[PDB]
Amino acid sequence: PFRTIARLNPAKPKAGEEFRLQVVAQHPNEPGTRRDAEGKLIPAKYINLVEVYFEGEKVAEARPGPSTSANPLYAFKFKAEKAGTFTIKLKDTDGDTGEASVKLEL
Amino acid sequence: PFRTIARLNPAKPKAGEEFRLQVVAQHPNEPGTRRDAEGKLIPAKYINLVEVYFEGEKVAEARPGPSTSANPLYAFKFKAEKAGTFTIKLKDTDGDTGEASVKLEL
């Protein structure tokens, strides 16, 4: 698995307020088209799915696509209604995974 | 130790171009004034030292105090000259540490 960290901004929003969930992943997002010093291709390995869950229910998704940058940041906007925990699951083209969680307290 | 991830934006800056280094840490940053549902003060435990190194030289620093937010983000602007590696070391008030690295390729 690859390192992932989830954070809320503001860290503790109040009920009814809009806030952002930010997920950062340590990942090369290798496209498969770059070559090493010998001219050999470096195999592709990029994040292709990000799923956000809140209290056991899927509430957001992202399909990053190809030609992305290393150590990406994914942002999602939500409205604070009730306290709960966000769990984010990420997957890449090699089948590798990332996972992070962050608690929402009002 | 606590999880830390460093990223650059743009991820691959051009020579002479300004870029941003972002460091995110998974950390509660307890101020020492919060009480749990039981009424127990929650002991302070926050990041109080952030040291950024580039090719062995310390090029950025922060010494945050209490009242900071959970899972903090610290950002610094640099100008790209030569390629090199960023290493960041974090420490908190209990002596726990975080470390991350990101390569600057032009």
What string of DSSP letters covers A58-92? Answer: EEEEE---SS--SS-EEEEEEE--S-EEEEEEEEE
| Residues on chain A touching B24 (C-beta within 8 angstroms) | 5, 7, 24
CB–CB of A87/A101 below 8 Å?
Answer: yes
A97: amino acid identity, one letter: T
With contact defined as beta carbons under 8 Å apart, do A46 and A23 qualify?
no
Q: Which of the 8 DSSP states describes residue A12?
A: S
What distance in Å separates the CA atoms of residue A101 and residue A48, rounded to the nearest whole number?
A: 19
Token match 């127990």: residue?
B40
**Neighbouring-strand partners of residue B58:** B53
Mention every residue, 6+ apart, whose C-beta is less than 8 A from residue B39: none
Tokens representing residue A82 in the block: 């009730």
Experiment type: X-ray
At residue B49's C-alpha, the angle toward residues A19 and B22, to 5°, is 45
How many residue pairs from chains A and B have C-beta atoms closer than 8 A? 54
Q: Is B3 on the interface with A (CB under 8 A)?
A: yes
Q: How far apart are CA A44 and CA A60, in angstroms?
A: 25
Rounded CA gap, A52 and A69, in Å?
21
Euclidean distance between CA atoms A16 and A104, whole angstroms: 13
Say if residues B97 and B89 touch (Cβ distance below 8 Å).
yes
- Give the amino acid at A39: G
A42: number of Cβ within 10 Å: 13
Per CB-CB distance under 8 Å, the chain B contacts of A26 are: 5, 100
Cβ separation B71–A6 shorter than 8 A: yes
DSSP B48: E
**CA end-to-end distance (rounded Å), chain A:** 31
Q: Is B11 on the interface with A (CB under 8 A)?
A: yes
Tell me which residue of A105, A48, A55, A101 sits closest to A80, measured CA to CA. A105
Distances (CA, A) of A35 to A31, A92, A98, B84, B104: 10, 20, 26, 19, 17
Q: Could you say which of A5, A12, A102 has the minimum Cβ distance to residue B5?
A: A5
CA distance B71 to A24: 11
Among residues B36, B78, B34, B33, the alpha carbon closest in space to that of B53 is found at B78
Distance in Å, alpha carbon of A103 to nearest chain B alpha carbon? 10
Residue in chain A lying closest to B5 (CA): A26
Residues of B in contact with A25 (CB under 8 A): 5
DSSP secondary structure code for residue B80 in this structure: -
Q: What's the fold here for domain B1-106?
A: Immunoglobulin-like (2.60.40)
- What's the sign of the alpha-carbon dihedral B1, B28, A11, B67? negative
| 3-class secondary-structure state, position A2 | coil
